[PDB]
């Protein structure tokens, strides 16, 4: 989706292609994050990325109890 | 795209609202979506969501082999 791809250091921008290359999209919310975080290393962006990765898992997974019910 | 879903709008806001009094965090790629496709009301909107939400889990399960061993 025209997807923000802003400031990509060398070890992420490396990962992120790992990931697509992968078959793994990654939510652009989580490119915003990562790039304001600036890590150092190709190791360390994965740990980080597949930690805030399974957060999304958890937030796309939790309850809304629907609410607004037709 | 004249309607009443523009860039955060009363129903999808609403929905976000429920979405945080339930706890759960949305991708920005969610709205940066949604809120230009523009749905009917409340829970036309989050059928949506919770669909790219859906997208979002299964995507976020796919494997990356790690690779980078530096």
């Known amino acids: 989706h025209m997807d923000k791809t802003v400031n ?4 992420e921008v490396a ?8 078959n793994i999209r990654i939510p652009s919310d989580i490119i915003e994050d990562l790039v304001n975080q600036r ?14 990765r399974t957060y ?12 607004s019910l037709k």
Chains 1, 2 share one sequence.
């Open 15 to 22: 990962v992120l292609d790992l990931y697509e290359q992968s």
């Open 39 to 52: 890590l150092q290393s190709e190791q360390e962006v994965l740990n980080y990325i597949e930690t805030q």
């Open 56 to 67: 999304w898992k958890l937030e796309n997974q939790k309850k809304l109890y629907r609410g």
């Open 8 to 11: 990509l250091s060398a070890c």
